[PDB]
Design a protein around this nucleic acid. Structure first.
Ligand SMILES: [Zn+2]
Ligand SMILES: [Zn+2]
Ligand SMILES: [Zn+2]
Ligand SMILES: [Zn+2]
Length: 111
DNA sequence: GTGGGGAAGGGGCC
DNA sequence: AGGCCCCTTCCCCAC
């Protein structure tokens, strides 16, 4: 629980305070050594490394399929079970992704 | 108008 | 203080 000196908002996490400040300046200290592409966060560079190496460690437990990223694994999991998990309370329309439900909720015409 | 890919942040655990 | 992973919303796209 720390307060950002710039936008005066509470940021939780001891080490996350420098990272949030990095979003107010646009600096990208981390740079890939192969494609020379600069990133704002280190973990994003780690994902970019997964692209170059070709590693797909996200292995489905039910069927054994391997995927590059986590969201690709999530998209495969809904095929195994729960194709359309979300729903609108008022209109009872099924949705696949949370943002898609918020898309209907952004209109908010049912409420 | 619907699905999805990727981006951009915030947080939890170690 | 930071790596590594998860989650979310949002832009923008082919269909
Ligand atoms: Zn700030
Ligand atoms: Zn690269
Ligand atoms: Zn599977
Ligand atoms: Zn609705």
């Amino acid at each position: 629980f720390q307060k950002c000196p710039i936008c005066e908002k509470v940021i939780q996490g001891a080490g996350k305070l420098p990272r949030h400040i990095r979003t107010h300046t646009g600096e990208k200290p981390y740079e890939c050594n192969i494609c020379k592409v600069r990133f704002t966060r280190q973990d994003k560079l780690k994902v970019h490394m997964r692209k170059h190496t070709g590693e797909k460690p996200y292995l489905c437990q039910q069927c054994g399929a391997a995927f590059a990223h986590n969201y690709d694994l999530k998209n495969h999991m809904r095929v195994h079970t729960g194709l359309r998990p979300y729903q609108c309370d008022s209109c009872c329309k099924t949705f696949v992704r949370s943002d898609h439900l918020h898309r209907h909720l952004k209109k908010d015409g049912c409420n």
